[PDB]
Structures are given as structure tokens and as C-alpha cells.
Amino acid sequence: KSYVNNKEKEVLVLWGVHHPPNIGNQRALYHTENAYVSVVSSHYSRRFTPEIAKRPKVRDQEGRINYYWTLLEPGDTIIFEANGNLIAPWYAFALSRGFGSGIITSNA
Amino acid sequence: SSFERFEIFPKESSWPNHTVTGVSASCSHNGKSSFYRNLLWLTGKNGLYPNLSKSYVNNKEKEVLVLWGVHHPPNIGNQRALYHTENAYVSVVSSHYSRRFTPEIAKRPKVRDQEGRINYYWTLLEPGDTIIFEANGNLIAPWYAFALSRGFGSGIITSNA
Amino acid sequence: VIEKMNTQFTAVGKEFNKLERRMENLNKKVDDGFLDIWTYNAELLVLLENERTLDFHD
Amino acid sequence: CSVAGWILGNPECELLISKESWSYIVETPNPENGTCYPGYFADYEELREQLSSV
Ligand SMILES: *[C@@H]1O[C@H](CO)[C@@H](O)[C@H](O)[C@H]1NC(C)=O
Ligand SMILES: *[C@@H]1O[C@H](CO)[C@@H](O)[C@H](O)[C@H]1NC(C)=O
Numbered sequence: 001k002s003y004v005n006n007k008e009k010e011v012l013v014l015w016g017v018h019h020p021p022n023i024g025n026q027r028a029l030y031h032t033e034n035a036y037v038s039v040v041s042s043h044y045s046r047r048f049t050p051e052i053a054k055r056p057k058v059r060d061q062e063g064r065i066n067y068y069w070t071l072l073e074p075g076d077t078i079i080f081e082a083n084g085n086l087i088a089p090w091y092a093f094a095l096s097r098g099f100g101s102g103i104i105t106s107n108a
Numbered sequence: 109s110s111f112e113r114f115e116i117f118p119k120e121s122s123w124p125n126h127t128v129t130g131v132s133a134s135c136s137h138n139g140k141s142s143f144y145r146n147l148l149w150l151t152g153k154n155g156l157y158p159n160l161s162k163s164y165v166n167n168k169e170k171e172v173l174v175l176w177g178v179h180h181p182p183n184i185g186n187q188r189a190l191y192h193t194e195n196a197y198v199s200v201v202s203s204h205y206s207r208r209f210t211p212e213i214a215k216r217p218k219v220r221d222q223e224g225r226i227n228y229y230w231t232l233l234e235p236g237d238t239i240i241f242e243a244n245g246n247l248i249a250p251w252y253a254f255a256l257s258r259g260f261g262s263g264i265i266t267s268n269a
Numbered sequence: 270v271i272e273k274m275n276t277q278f279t280a281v282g283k284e285f286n287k288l289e290r291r292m293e294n295l296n297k298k299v300d301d302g303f304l305d306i307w308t309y310n311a312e313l314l315v316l317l318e319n320e321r322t323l324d325f326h327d
Numbered sequence: 328c329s330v331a332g333w334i335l336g337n338p339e340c341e342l343l344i345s346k347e348s349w350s351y352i353v354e355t356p357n358p359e360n361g362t363c364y365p366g367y368f369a370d371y372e373e374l375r376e377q378l379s380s381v
Contacts, residue, residue: 012334012377014334014335016366019206019366051199051206051208053199053201053206053208053240053242054161054201054240054242055201055203055206055240056201056202056203056237056238056240058203058365059363059364059365061364061365063365064206064364064365064366064367065362065364065365065366066366066367066368066369067331067335067362067366067367067368067369067371068369068370069369069370069374071377091336093334095381096381097380097381098380098381099380101349101350101351101352101379101380101381102279102281102351102352102379103281103330103351103352103353103354103375103378103379104281104351104352104353104354105353105354105355105356106353106354106355106356107355107356203365204287206367232287281379283372283375283376284371284372284375285372286372289372
């Protein structure tokens, strides 16, 4: 899949990669033991593979999803390829930058 | 400010089907080959390197510093002699840590007359968590670990006074 | 006093990872150092001006 | 919600999906609704810095 940033704005694209707790789960969901995820843009390139491992449970779930992101410049193209283990982007954010804002921590 | 140095995986009882004896000339002590004191170089036993799986639960109130390494032999013959596989991996996870390592085989300049390398890795295990170690080979296992106690005002200085 | 103490400084903090402690501590050092310096300058400017003001009036 | 929760979307952060503009962002001291499916968020701190100018 690919997307061309036809907006005047930078686009924040997020996606993830699934890392099953075992082989049986990898076979049940993607039906391959040799999956990869590859994401590229004119100024970005990363290839990911799943890792299978025994892990402590977190939130009662064994297995993990790693999250990744990139900013796609206006006019560029982002390309996603996979054999499995991809948590696909659905929504993305066309960003508009300004000045003076920030993130604060408060319970007021 | 202080720490408790304790065994996580006692040498005698933790690995009954692996060889836990292994030394190198480069760590020679008093003329004899030797090795790191808080680590164990695990190698095969009777021709096998059984799939390894170990874990530790941090049952202390303190953070635990766990160190381990990965061996990268100078050649294929050494990989076959020690682990008996050409496709080894080491995998270390915790609730907030995950890393998978593989050995690399390469011709290298000698350092301390030794071709081949051991990379060293570490992580801090939070109280209540679990660290899990899995391997097909090339693991220099943790033996001892440090239960850390933090304080204020200390630091490391360089001096010959 | 008002004109000199012009604040263009941004103090919104940053998060760091467990393996970025050296960077976190550098950031902390920078913020604390600037705070100590400006606290020093503000207090010293006020004390020196209060003393000169009273001499002026006398 | 944590910043990760807000951006990835989180079933419990549904009330935020409709708000497109703001003057500042307020996070509580210990947000809970973050990465509901456990995992490592790459360059999270760096994303928080990018979103501080949006
Ligand atoms: C310790 O340092 C001396 C320095 O001359 C060196 O010759 C020796 O090989 C070192 N031994 C170990 C185990 O690092
Ligand atoms: C063989 O090695 C594994 C290593 O994780 C250990 O758990 C198991 O108890 C060992 N067993 C024998 C000799 O039966």
C-alpha cells in the first residue's frame, strides 16, 4: 500500500508490528513463520521482523505490539509492505504547527 | 551508595545439562586461564546445547542490575565446537525490555591476543518484575547480580591520590 | 528593572528514557543552572537598587 | 489518557477524537489509558516533543 501526501501539511503516520507469544499464534494469524514489515518514504527506511519469545504478562497479555511513526513531508509517498505482523495505519494526522503551546502535567 | 551482590542463577544447580566451566587465556589469573566472576560462559555438554530457558523474579524491594553477554566466535569451526549450531540466538525480555541478539562471525584483528568478541549487555529489573533468558547458544549467562540501593551526593571521580 | 527582565525562555519539560539518563541529567543541569543565575541576578539587582534608591532620596 | 493513548487511539479516549485544535495539552500525573496492548513505543519522547508544537 501507498499514500501520497497531497496535503500542504505534514502527515503523522503511525503503525505497529505484532510479536506473538509463540509459533502457534504466528501460524494462526498470519500463516507464515517468516514475516517482515517494510516501511519506506523518500527519507525513511525501516524493516521490521517479528520476534517470538516467552514474555512476562502485561495486562494479562503475553506478546507485544511495537509502535512506530514517521512524519511524511508534503508531496512525498509512504509505502507499506508486509507478509504479516502489520498493524496497519488507518487514520493519520495532518499537522498544523504554531508557537507557544506545550504539554503540561496537571490535575487542576 | 551500596548494593547486595547475590546469585541469581547459582552455578551448580542452575544448568545441570550445560558445561559451566570455561575459561580464556585473555582473563588469565595467576598464570591460569580464567573468566569474569559475575558471569558464566555456557557451552554444550556431551555434544549438545539444549535449548535454554531461565527466569528470575525480583522478589527484593530493590532494583536489580543484571548483566550478561553474547559470544561472537572468530569462525564457524568455533561456533560448531562450542554451541553445536550455526543458528544461535539469545533472547532477553522483561515487562519493559526486549532484545534479541544473534552472533556474528567475522575475521577480526586480535585484541589481547584473542580473535572473537563478547558483547556485554545489562538491564535494571524493577521490583516485582521477571526477567527471562532464552538461548540456542552464544550466551554468557548472568551468575551474580546487584540489588541496588540508591542515595545522594556520590559520584565517580578519576584520581591517583 | 522591568525592561531588563524580559522572558523569552521556554520551560516546558521533556521526557527521557531509562537509557537517556545522561541526557536527562544534562537537561536538569541546564535548567537548574539558569534558574540559579537568574535568581541571583534578580535578588542582587533588587538589593542594589533598593540601597541606591534610599541613598538617592537622602 | 496518555499522549500515546490519544494518538494511537484508545477505546477509552474516544472523547478526544473529535477535538482538533487546542491552546495547550494537559496530561494527568499518572495516566492509565496508554498503550492498552503492551509493547514498546518507539521514539515516544521524541513524538511528545513533536506534538508540543502542534
Ligand atoms: C590486568 O592488568 C594487567 C596490566 O599490566 C594485564 O597485564 C593483565 O592481563 C590484566 N588481567 C585481566 C584479567 O584483565
Ligand atoms: C535441561 O536444561 C533446561 C534448561 O532450561 C532445564 O530447565 C532442565 O531442567 C534440564 N534438564 C535435565 C537434565 O533433565
